Amino acid sequence: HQPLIARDGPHPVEQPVHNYMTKVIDRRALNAAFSLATEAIALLTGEAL
Amino acid sequence: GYRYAAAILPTGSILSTIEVASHRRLFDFFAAVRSDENSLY
């Protein structure tokens, strides 16, 4: 919303104005990947001990 | 570093944190490794 002044004389009368605006959000995405070492998976999961 | 079980105790300050091996490659042995490699085990 806006404030007004009270102009005098040879001019149009200032009238109150209000301004509504609509602005839209944005979607993005990030990523990372730790590929785990093959035999070490078997070494941690059991059945190589 | 070559013997990996020795580096399980680091016993010193990994301290510089600069881009390794883009420097002089003066190392007698160095391995630029991703998240894992089978020779580690």
CA-CA distance, A17 to B30, in Å (whole number)?
Answer: 70
Q: Which of B4, B2, B40 is nearest to A44 (CA)?
A: B40
Instruction: Give exposure, B2-23, as e/b (b: 16+ Cβ within 10 Å).
Output: eeeeeeeeeeeeeeeeeeeeee
Method by which this entry was solved = cryo-EM
SS3 breakdown of chain A: % helix, strand, coil, rounded to 5? 15, 0, 85
DSSP string covering A15-30: ----------------
Q: Which two tokens mark B27?
A: 């190392």
| Chain B CB contacts of A44 below 8 Å | none
B37 has a chain A CB within 8 A of its CB: yes
What size, in residues, is chain B? 41
| Chain A CB contacts of B34 below 8 Å | 35
Longest dimension (CA), chain A: 97
CA angle A36, B6, B22 (to 5 degrees): 65
Q: Which of A34, A35, A38 is facing B38, going by the closest CB pair?
A: A38
